[PDB]
């Protein structure tokens, strides 16, 4: 011991001044980078994230499986951006963008930014572009595996992706922008650039009475240079609502003993909220002020 502990804080010094403070880490670290963040919608992955949100100036990868709630993932945190006044591009080989349930998310769709580009090529072209103008401060790729190479429109989208990915990640670095490729592939170029890399699954269904409302969702941050990389978070996207978050509240509020509930009963500083976390989530909805200041108290014990 002592002499040993010494040895190790030096090296472990040593190895973050060589390669960055995110190189090596303790699984169980409270300590996170000082990096800004845009939320994602959701307080569990914000707080399994390490820094509180997606970091601004990094490429973030989201994959899943089609109808694992990646969609309502990503128009959330362009809400979130677009609320705190940040430009956001979206760039699109879908072709599926849903501009009413983005407006129900809260997505200024009149001014977001949108392309549909030609090939893969000119959609990282049109993305670099965007990184190097420093006006511009989330763009979300939709998606990877959409994203053709022009040859194969008339292996080659690895080599295109390594490519792009250098000159890209240097620019966003500098102008200080997040980029998002939402996935289902590329290849090693992302997995090695991005600085989180989330795997978000449906995990089942959520039904008031046998009607299905909504679906439960887990996210394991499989890779996060930015605090301590494997947590996860569960939470509930409601069809045509977006991830439940005042749901969340309640359930990190009593875990953190700001909410007390005696079996079906919560209550909040001595006066009943609601029976059951659906009248206590109700009433946190319809108590905003009360909410924030829950939700402040959460985030500053465990962020």
Not at 16 to 33: A, V, Y
Not at 63 to 80: M, N
Request: glycine share 10%; aromatic share 6%; charged share 25%.
């Amino acid at each position: 011991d002592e002499n040993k502990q010494k040895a190790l804080a030096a090296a472990l010094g040593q190895i973050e001044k060589q390669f960055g403070k995110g190189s090596i880490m303790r699984l169980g670290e409270d300590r996170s980078m000082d990096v800004e963040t845009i939320s994602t919608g959701s307080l569990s992955l914000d707080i399994a994230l390490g820094a509180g949100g997606l970091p601004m100036g990094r490429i973030v990868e989201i994959y899943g499986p089609e109808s694992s709630g990646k969609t309502t993932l990503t128009l959330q945190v362009i809400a979130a951006a677009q609320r705190e006044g940040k430009t956001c591009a979206f760039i699109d080989a879908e072709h599926a963008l849903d501009p009413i349930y983005a407006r129900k998310l809260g997505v200024d769709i009149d001014n977001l930014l949108c392309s549909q580009p030609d090939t893969g090529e000119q959609a990282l072209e049109i993305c670099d572009a965007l990184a190097r103008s420093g006006a511009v401060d989330v763009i979300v790729v939709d998606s990877v595996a959409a994203l053709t190479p022009k040859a194969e429109i008339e292996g080659l989208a690895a080599r295109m992706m390594s490519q792009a990915m250098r000159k890209l990640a240097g620019n966003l670095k500098q102008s200080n922008t997040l980029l998002i490729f939402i996935n289902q592939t590329g290849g090693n170029a992302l997995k090695f650039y991005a600085s989180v890399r989330l795997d978000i699954r449906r995990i089942g269904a959520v039904k008031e009475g046998e009607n299905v409302v909504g679906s439960e969702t887990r996210v394991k941050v499989v890779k996060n240079k930015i605090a301590a990389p494997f947590k996860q978070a569960e939470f509930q996207i409601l069809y045509g609502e977006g991830i439940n978050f005042y749901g969340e509240l309640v359930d990190l509020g009593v875990k953190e003993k700001l909410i007390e509930k005696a079996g079906a009963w919560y209550s909040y500083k001595g006066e009943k909220i609601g029976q059951g976390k659906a009248n206590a989530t109700a009433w946190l909805k319809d108590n905003p002020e009360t909410a924030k200041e829950i939700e402040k108290k959460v985030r500053e014990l465990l962020l």
